[PDB]
């Protein structure tokens, strides 16, 4: 896979890891819709809003399978550790007008 999943469950915003690269979700948007990171980095999405959101990568992007992340409640978080250079587009499953990308290089 081009990413590993530290936790299949969301977890509390306060539990975000030192060194994680944070993307806030607020105002029905990924607040950093184009993020550039290094191989080995952990990206953590944190939902800052009442409405639930996830991150969803279709099949062939992070590996063979689609990665449909868990729904994050307000002040919940979810991480992916990127292990290979590339450009990885994602969207929010319930809100597909929410689009983002992670560029690993
Ligand atoms: Cu959403």
Curated annotation (Swiss-Prot):
Cofactor entry: Cu cation
One GO CC term on file: periplasmic space
Compartments where located: Periplasm
UniProt-recorded name of the protein: Amicyanin
Gene (name only): mauC
Primary location: periplasm
Cofactor note: Binds 1 copper ion per subunit.
Single Gene Ontology MF annotation: copper ion binding
Metal-binding found in the keyword field: yes
Residue ranges of domain Plastocyanin-like in the record: 1-105
Record: residues binding Cu cation: 53, 92, 95, 98
Pathway: One-carbon metabolism; methylamine degradation
């Amino acid at each position: 896979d081009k990413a590993t999943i530290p936790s299949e469950s969301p977890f509390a915003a306060a539990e975000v890891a030192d060194g994680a690269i944070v993307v806030d979700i607020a105002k029905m948007k990924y607040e950093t819709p184009e993020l550039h990171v290094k191989v080995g980095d952990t990206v953590t999405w944190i939902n800052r809003e009442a409405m639930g959101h996830n991150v969803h990568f279709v099949a062939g992007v992070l590996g063979e399978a689609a990665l449909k992340g868990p729904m994050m409640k307000k002040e919940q978080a979810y991480s992916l550790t990127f292990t290979e250079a590339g450009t990885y587009d994602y969207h929010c499953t319930p809100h597909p007008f929410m689009r983002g990308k992670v560029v690993v290089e």
